[PDB]
Amino acid sequence: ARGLGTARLQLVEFSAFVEPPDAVDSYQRHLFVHISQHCPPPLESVDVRQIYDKFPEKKGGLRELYDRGPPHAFFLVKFWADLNWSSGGFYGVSSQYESLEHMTLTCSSKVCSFGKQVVEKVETERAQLEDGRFVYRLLRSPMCEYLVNFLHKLRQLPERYMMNSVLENFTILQVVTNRDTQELLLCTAYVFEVSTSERGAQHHIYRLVRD
Numbered sequence: 001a002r003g004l005g006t007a008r009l010q011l012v013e014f015s016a017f018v019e020p021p022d023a024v025d026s027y028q029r030h031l032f033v034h035i036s037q038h039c040p041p042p043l044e045s046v047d048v049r050q051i052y053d054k055f056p057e058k059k060g061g062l063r064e065l066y067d068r069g070p071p072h073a074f075f076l077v078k079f080w081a082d083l084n085w086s087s088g089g090f091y092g093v094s095s096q097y098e099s100l101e102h103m104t105l106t107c108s109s110k111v112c113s114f115g116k117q118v119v120e121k122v123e124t125e126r127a128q129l130e131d132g133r134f135v136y137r138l139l140r141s142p143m144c145e146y147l148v149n150f151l152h153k154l155r156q157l158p159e160r161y162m163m164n165s166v167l168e169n170f171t172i173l174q175v176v177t178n179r180d181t182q183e184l185l186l187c188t189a190y191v192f193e194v195s196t197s198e199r200g201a202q203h204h205i206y207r208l209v210r211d
């Protein structure tokens with residue numbers, strides 16, 4: 001793999017953002033995190049066993065997911081989030097995938113704290129046939145309230161190193177499956193640090209492997 005995806009399903013763009021109330025007047029959004037793969041060296045690898053404890057146990061945990069396979073569909077994304085941006089704006093998440101196959105997708109996003117699942121969001125999205133390939137658009141999903149509240153608290157911490165200590169215990173697991181066949185298509189584990197404002201958001205993608 002040279003990016004986040006397989007031959008069956010590719011991530012095109014992913015982002016989490018806030019538009020301030022003013023946006024109606026002069027548009028603007030702040031990206032907390034953001035992946036853009038609008039384009040065509042193999043990724044680095046990380047053994048999945050090192051991150052087992054950072055995600056839930058039993059059904060829906062990394063070990064049982066990896067065991068069910070397929071192994072090539074598992075990725076780890078490290079985000080340096082930009083928490084420099086404010087009261088009543090719109091907080092949103094947007095995702096877009098592509099495949100050659102027409103499918104109906106189920107996307108499950110699990111927020112975990114100290115490796116225990118804290119909240120879950122499950123969504124389905126049917127293929128739209130555009131330009132020989134199929135596109136899946138989950139755009140402008142309102143950010144769930146736990147996460148907006150978490151962000152507002154985090155941003156007020158007096159020191160970056162304490163934000164990093166707190167974020168050390170906060171992870172997100174995304175499982176995309178073929179809603180009709182139950183086949184897993186993509187599983188992405190996210191881990192987080194804060195960036196330094198002068199540096200906006202950045203990320204690094206790894207393949208999750210298993211010796």
Ligand SMILES: CCCCCCCCCCCCCC(=O)O
Pocket residue numbers: 016032033081093109111120121142143144147151172190192
């Ligand atoms: C430290 C800020 C965390 C970054 C904001 C979340 C970005 C990762 C994906 C969030 C998707 C979760 C879907 C949801 O639960 O609303």
